[PDB]
């Protein structure tokens, strides 16, 4: 391992801005689902705790306020090649989530459905700031349930909501696997109370446990 050095000629603090630090479209979710007509669709509660690269980067702060700019990147793989129409219906807090591919919740007029094809450019929607507190508690020292032996560290206000993606097409002669990559670029970011960077590896996505 050689040891080199170079004169570091820099100018400016603008790249270390927190708006500039966090606004990168990081992959926040990726699962495949077989399709033949979860029961053959993609739902995901929008959190940032799925991948430890963005999680530790966002756990540098206590409170965050951002518009999540979700970009649904959908690729398809056949087990002829069809052209497909998808629905990336965004289900907020309070609206019910689908359990099947053909439930009555996909046709909900109040949910912010986006209808896009695979041959199109990837679907991109700007999900706004929907915490009901004025910032997302990245760490919530406290309990959801009022003096209940349930789950610690879950803010009732920080629920973005389930992002539910299905294939609008009916039954087709080929069975195929659909991998839904969700890319979230947080933007219009304000951030409060910086925190120490986490050193120990994570044990769960529900909490801040550590093994040592």
């Amino acid at each position: 391992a050689i040891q080199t050095r170079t004169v570091i000629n820099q100018h400016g603090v603008s790249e270390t801005l927190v708006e500039n630090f966090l606004s990168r479209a990081a992959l926040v979710s990726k699962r495949s689902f077989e399709y033949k007509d979860d029961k053959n669709f993609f739902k995901w509660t929008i959190n940032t705790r799925s991948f430890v690269q963005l999680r530790r980067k966002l756990e540098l702060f206590t409170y965050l306020r951002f518009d999540a700019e979700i970009t649904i990147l959908t690729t398809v793989a056949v087990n002829g090649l069809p052209d497909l129409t998808l629905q990336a219906m965004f289900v907020p807090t309070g609206a019910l989530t689908p359990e099947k591919q053909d439930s009555f919740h996909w046709q909900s007029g109040s949910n912010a459905s986006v209808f896009f094809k695979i041959s199109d450019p990837p679907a991109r929607i700007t999900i706004p700031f929907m915490c009901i507190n004025s910032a997302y508690s990245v760490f919530y020292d406290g309990f959801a349930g009022f003096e209940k032996n349930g789950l610690y560290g879950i803010n009732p206000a920080d629920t973005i909501g389930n992002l539910c993606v299905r294939i609008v097409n009916e039954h087709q002669p080929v069975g195929f696997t659909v991998t839904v990559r969700v890319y979230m670029k947080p933007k219009h970011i304000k951030a409060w109370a910086p925190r120490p960077p986490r050193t120990l590896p994570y044990m769960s996505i529900a909490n801040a446990n550590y093994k040592g």
Partner: protein, 244 residues
């Protein structure tokens, strides 16, 4: 209508674009902004805050004993207490600090730092240290005689129990050739016992040092990357619970 042709790079999803997109819930007023204390507008404000170094730098020091250097009658006359390799990237005292861990999110980094060595013995405990900044390219001092030849500061801890220590311009970055290419060296801050430790018969024979590190306003960071301090290998528990 308007005659438009498609450029190359049309329909691409560049993950570092800044194009405003169609909002999912327009005509939805978000929660109004509340004045939350301590807004971070800039990640250098995280870096300029002092943070403890792991100045013990022995292999047997596990966990919390890394933050302190014990001095006693075992340190006889002239002992190297600690050297601080000033490589933020490499594993050492400056690795697990605020200037350490935020500069691992950025490739290229350059600026002055600022050490603070707080002595944590008794009030009666007197003695001297000699805190020696070796510039990069120079050799680390092995004896206290070599240590007072270079840049140093002879610190008697009488009433003076803390030393602001301006380090000029620790820079460095990452490298890759046609990897295994790190920063060479950005110098050292070594500490030798000038005197012996003097404690009375009631104060403890073993006294300690806490070292801090902070960046000044001229410290800068660029070419943001991913920090390898974390990494998932097997699984996280209930990772599928965000989908079920």
């Amino acid at each position: 209508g308007v005659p438009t042709y498609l450029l190359p790079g049309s329909g691409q999803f560049l993950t570092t674009d800044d194009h405003s997109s169609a909002p999912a819930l327009p005509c939805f007023n978000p929660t109004p902004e509340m004045h939350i204390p301590g807004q971070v507008r800039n990640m250098l404000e995280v870096v300029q805050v002092e943070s403890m170094m792991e100045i013990n730098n022995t292999e047997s020091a596990v966990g919390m004993e890394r933050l302190k250097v014990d001095i006693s009658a075992l340190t006889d006359v002239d002992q190297l207490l600690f050297n601080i390799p000033l490589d933020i990237q490499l594993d050492g005292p400056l690795r697990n600090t605020l200037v350490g861990n935020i500069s691992r999110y950025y490739t290229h980094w350059s600026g002055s730092l600022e050490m603070t060595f707080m002595f944590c013995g008794s009030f009666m405990a007197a003695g001297k240290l000699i805190l020696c900044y070796t510039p990069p390219g120079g050799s680390c001092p092995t004896t206290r005689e070599t240590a007072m030849l270079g840049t140093h500061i002879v610190w008697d801890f009488g009433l003076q129990s803390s030393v602001t220590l301006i380090i000029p311009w620790i820079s460095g970055s990452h490298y890759r050739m046609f990897a295994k290419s790190t920063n060479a060296n950005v110098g050292y801050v070594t500490c030798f016992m000038q005197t012996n430790l003097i404690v009375p018969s009631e104060s403890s024979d073993t006294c300690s040092l806490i070292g801090f590190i902070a960046a000044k306003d001229d410290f800068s960071l660029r070419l943001m990357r991913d920090s390898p301090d974390i990494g998932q290998l097997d699984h996280l528990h209930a990772a599928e619970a965000a989908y079920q």
